[PDB]
């Protein structure tokens, strides 16, 4: 593990095996571990592709590190998904592990798929950032933030959730719906800012196209144009 070193505003990357006489380290307090999000690197956050980023597998035990200070998130995710016959896809969250502290949007993806694998890891190395703990596995029913951790050596001196319904999760033939009513939904055409999904939310309770004891599934196509399925 490499060690970030910073003087004034300069960021050098040493280790200690390269740290020079008098990079004055005088306190354990100058050591910090940071957790930044992939979100702020370009990485899309469209629920479909973000899902496409993770995967399942067994025989490999989950690990956890702890980070001291995080980054405000625009997007986060909450996974309560299962395999067709009840049976949960994901483990429950062991003690101490809580939902990531700061999200503007939480993407509660309820649904179902096949879970070939006991745990679900990240397919690019990234950690799932929970409340000050970074795991290599997604735990059930708990919000998190895709991110990566670094280690520094300093110098001396509200939210909203969005609900989803999904099928064949692990699969390649997956299908994503945006849950607005107990009986109404909308098809996710990937490119969909959360602000926009919340504007659909507003334009549905306003317009009036939320079904009545018979379940409907509309499809927007871009004041705009919403169709229906069958």
């Amino acid at each position: 593990i490499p060690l970030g070193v910073i003087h004034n505003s300069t960021l050098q990357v040493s280790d200690v095996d390269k740290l020079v006489c008098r990079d004055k380290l005088s306190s354990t307090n100058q050591l910090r571990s940071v957790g930044l999000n992939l979100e702020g690197n370009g990485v899309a956050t469209d629920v479909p592709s973000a899902t496409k980023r993770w995967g399942f597998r067994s025989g490999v035990p989950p690990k956890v590190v702890n980070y001291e200070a995080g980054e405000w998130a625009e997007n986060c995710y909450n996974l309560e998904i299962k395999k067709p016959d009840g049976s949960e896809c994901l483990p429950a969250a062991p003690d101490g592990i809580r939902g990531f502290p700061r999200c503007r949007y939480v993407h509660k993806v309820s649904g179902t798929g096949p879970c070939a694998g006991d745990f679900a890891f990240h397919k690019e190395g990234a950690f799932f950032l929970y409340d000050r703990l970074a795991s290599t596995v997604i735990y059930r029913g708990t919000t998190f933030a895709e991110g990566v951790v670094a280690f520094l050596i300093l110098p001396q001196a509200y939210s909203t959730t969005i609900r989803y319904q999904a099928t064949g999760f692990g699969t390649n033939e997956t299908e994503y719906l945006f849950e607005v009513d107990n009986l109404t939904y909308v098809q996710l055409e990937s490119r969909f800012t959360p602000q926009f999904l919340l504007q659909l939310n507003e334009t549905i309770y306003t317009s009036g196209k939320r079904s009545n004891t018979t379940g409907k599934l509309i499809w927007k196509v871009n004041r705009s144009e919403e169709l229906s399925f069958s």
Partner: antibody
Amino acid sequence: EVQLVESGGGLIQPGGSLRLSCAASGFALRMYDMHWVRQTIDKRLEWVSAVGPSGDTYYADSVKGRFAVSRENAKNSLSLQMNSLTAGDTAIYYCVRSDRGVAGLFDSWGQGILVTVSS
Amino acid sequence: IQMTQSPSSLSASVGDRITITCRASQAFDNYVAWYQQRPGKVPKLLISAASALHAGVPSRFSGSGSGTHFTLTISSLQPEDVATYYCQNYNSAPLTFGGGTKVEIKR
């Protein structure tokens, strides 16, 4: 709207074989986990089996090793291969749609088809 | 892991209130569904999440309970309510149904 139509049932000898088929309309199979649930002679309801859109199959232990469930998404159809049958498998069998979202919640039921196993 | 119901049968007049009880062995975060099967007909989903009323069911139907004791109540019993009611654990394994409670009108 949602319609589920079972076929392929009837009377069979024990140790015999039957194939139930279910034709779905009004939604799309890709989107749902599909189940088979049966009502035995004691009018008790009993979950029999399930299959996901990717073909992941599941069975109640009471039929496990004897039954095989499968689906064809493109045909919007599903089937239950019932083998090594016993008198205890005598029941009304229902093709059933589970709520897309959470598993085990049976929101749509077919009309049911009778299977009798006897000599 | 085991659903059992009480009673096996009950009688009440039209307009009366009744209560069906569903006992769970083990607990499972209260994922309990109630189904209605009218005589000679196919079962219909009435209630999920112990208390969430579904499509087309009158508000006289209410559900409650937690842990392992769960209940279904009809506040104004009507003739079309005559049926067998099943509780079922879902979102858990195994998926099992109660033995059913048969509801009749007392006249």
